[PDB]
Amino acid sequence: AQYEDGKQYTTLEKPVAGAPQVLEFFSFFCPHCYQFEEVLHISDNVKKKLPEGVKMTKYHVNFMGGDLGKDLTQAWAVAMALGVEDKVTVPLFEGVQKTQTIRSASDIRDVFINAGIKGEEYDAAWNSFVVKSLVAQQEKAAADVQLRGVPAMFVNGKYQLNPQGMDTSNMDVFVQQYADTVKYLSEK
């Protein structure tokens, strides 16, 4: 076949029922995640090729960057609750991996302030039980698929993308192949 289990994707031995249609995991400490967001725009190009009626979910993980990793998972929950993912993703990546100006929760907070979320609004969100359940959702989804590495994408809690088995000579070709794979798995 042109798409083979074990080649552009793998199949979960233990399929996850009720899982989000398209589910992505990342960390702001994860170097390929930086690439996926900043250079390749994976999420965006997958969205562009996905059918209609298909929702896209993206979660942060705890297992990188110790205490700051968990702060970043809570901050991503704030981002999701306020709907400001698109305003903070790049400055968080760059503050963590490029400039190294993110070293504490207060530094994460500055990124939101400078993106124009009000101090008050952020701190209230940060402490809210809406963000708490949203943090639990992120952890549960990762727990559900035994997640040990990022970037990771899962389709219908059944199939896991396998970028290692795609050509990387050309970044644009890599992305369309990744996206077309998601579309294929989506229709499966």
| Structure-block tokens of residue 150 | 């990022």
Q: How far is CA 7 from CA 24, 156, 178, in A?
A: 19, 18, 12
* Phi, psi dihedrals of residue 182, rounded to the nearest 5°: -60, -45
Give pairs for 166-175: CB < 8 Å, separation 24+: 166/8, 171/39, 171/40, 174/40, 175/40, 175/41, 175/42, 175/45
Resolution in A: 2.0
For the chain, domains (ranges, CATH) are: 1-188 (3.40.30.10)
DSSP-derived letter for residue 94 is I
Q: Is the peptide bond before 151 cis (omega within 30 degrees of 0)?
A: yes
